[model samples]
Each structure stands twice: as structure tokens, then as C-alpha cells.
Target: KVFGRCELAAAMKRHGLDNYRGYSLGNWVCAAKFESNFNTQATNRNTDGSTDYGILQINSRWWCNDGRTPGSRNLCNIPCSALLSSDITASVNCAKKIVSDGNGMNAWVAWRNRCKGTDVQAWIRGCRL
Candidate 1:
């Protein structure tokens, strides 16, 4: 499922992403915009043989177990397949785990390069949330 901008924001907010780990809802929206363009089934393979899955692009190596990554920690204790579901609850939960682990939103390089330190509010502009 691919979400429209405000649609994604509202969804994330409903799942408690607002101000999660000191990051605003806009921060999460901005990261998802760059990470997967709001597509739930997004996946990208890393050079290190790990894969990123879902809207937030949670990594298989450290967060979810894909059963293919050489050293997958499965820290989120979920299958990587769960992250690809259109229902984003699993993805959001795993992302929370990532942030709580001291990585913050920087766990996704897309956020660091494009969303960090900017007017992230623009990402969620016009949304009713």
C-alpha cells in the first residue's frame, strides 16, 4: 500500500509515532517520504547482504530477522515479512525499538541526509493531525 502524505502522517500518529524518542510526527513523516515514499512493501537490499523493509525501511541485519542476513539480531523479535504488510503497526513498533536503542531517527540515512535539521513540519503540512 502506498500512502498519500497526510494519510501516512495520520496513520503514524494513530500508532503513537508522534514525539516518539523526541522526534516529531513530521520527522517520522519526512523519513518515510524519503525512505520508501510511503510504500508499505518497499524493500532494498544492502551491499552487506542485509535488506531494508517497509515504509520506514527497517533493516533486517539489526531489527528484523529475514533469515537471510548473516548476522541478523532480530532485535525487534519480528519476521522481516511483517514489516512489508500494509498494516504499518509492526513497522512502527520496530522503528520504535530502533530509536530506543540510541540510534534515534539517524538509523535511516535518508532522514540524516534530507529530513534532519530542516523544517520537517512541511512534511506534514496541511494535515489535520
Candidate 2:
């Protein structure tokens, strides 16, 4: 399930998540763009051989279950594939948990490199509700 940028924004609004766990919606938008281009099925193999999954690109090593990834902490208690769905519900909830744990958006290198300290309004600009 892929999402148009505006659809992602609307889902965020519907979830009351414009400011969840202290990270702004714009930050999320920017991070997701770099991480997955809003594709829910996006997955990337990290240098360490772990996988990053879905729009927010949560790591399979720390946040989700993957049969191939033994010793996974799976803090979210969800299979990695669950993050690869069109519905943002589980992804949103898991991301909030991650940010609340103090990584903030810094958990994502994309956010640190591209989104940090930028005026990210364009991430949400002109998306009418």
C-alpha cells in the first residue's frame, strides 16, 4: 500500500498525530519521504544486515519481528510486515513509542541528515485537509 503525500498527511491528522511524542508532522513527512517515498512496502537492507521496514523505516532488529532476524527485541510486538500496510495505524503507534523512548526522530538517519533544523512546512504545504 503506497500513499500519496497528501493522503499521508490526512491520515496523520485523522490519527491526531500532528505532534505525537514531541516530533512534528513535518518531521515525519520529511523522514518518510527519504526513508520510503511514502511506500508502505518499502524495505531496505542496512549495512549491518538488519532491515528497515515501512514508511517510518523502523528497524527490524529493534522494533519488529522478522523470522530471519533472530534476537529481535520487537518492542512493538508486531511483525515487520505489519508495518508494510496501507493503513498507518500500527505504524503511527509504533513510531510514537519509539520517539517516546528518547531517540526522537534521530532514530532515522534520514531525519538527522535531511530534516533536522529545517523549516519543513513544504512537507505539509498546500495539502488541503
Candidate 3:
């Protein structure tokens, strides 16, 4: 599913991403915009043989198991396919786990490059959160 900006904001907020580990809802929303453009089934294969899956593009090398990444930790202990569901529960959960694991939102480079240290409020400006 491809979510509208406010729709994704609401969904992320509903899943507890708002200020989860000091990052704002805007941060997440912005990252999601750049990472996958709110597409649930988005996937990007890295040159290192790992794949980024789902909306937030959680990595196969450390977050989810794709059975092909050589050193997958599967820190979320979920199959990569789970991240592709339109429901987004697993994707949100894994994102939470990634943040709580000490990586914070920096686990997604797109966040660092596009959302970090910026006024991300624009991402959720009209969301009415």
C-alpha cells in the first residue's frame, strides 16, 4: 500500500513511533517518505548482499532474515517478508526494535541525510496529530 503523507503519519503515530526514543513523528514520517515513499512492498538490494525491506527499508543484514544475507542477525527475529505486508505492524515493530537497540533512527541513512537535525514538522504539518 502507498500511504498519503498524513495517512503514513497517522499510522506511524498509531504504532507508537512518535517520539519513540526521542525522535519525533516528523522524523519517522520524513524518513519513510525518502526511504520507501510509503510503499509497503518496497525493497532495495544492497551491494553487500543484504536487502532493505518494506517501508522503512529495514535491512536483511541485521534486522530481518532474508536467508541470503551472509551475516544476518535477524535482530527483529522476523522473516523479511513480514515487513512487506500492507498492514505495517511488523514494519513498525521492527523499526521500534531498531531504535531501542541503541541505533536510534540513524539506522536508516535516509533519516540521517534527509530528516536528521532538520525541521521535519513539514512532514506532518497537516496531519492534525
Q: Candidate 3 lDDT, tens digit per residue, 3-122?
A: 999988998998989988988899998999999989999999999989999999999999888989996798899999999998989999888888888778777899999888899998
lDDT of 1 by residue, 21-63 (tens): 8899999999999999999999999999999999999998888
What clash pairs does model 2 have?
none
Best-matching candidate per lDDT: 1
lDDT scores for all predictions? Answer: 0.91, 0.87, 0.90
Give the residue spans of candidate 3 off by over 4 A.
Answer: none
For residues 16-115, what per-residue lDDT tens digits would candidate 2 score against the true structure? 7787876667888888899999999999998877899999999989999878776768999999999998888888889888888877778889999999
In the order shown, the candidates' Cα RMSDs to the true structure are 0.8, 1.1, 0.9
Listed in order, each prediction's TM-score against the native is: 0.97, 0.94, 0.96
In model 1, which regions exceed 4 Å deviation? none
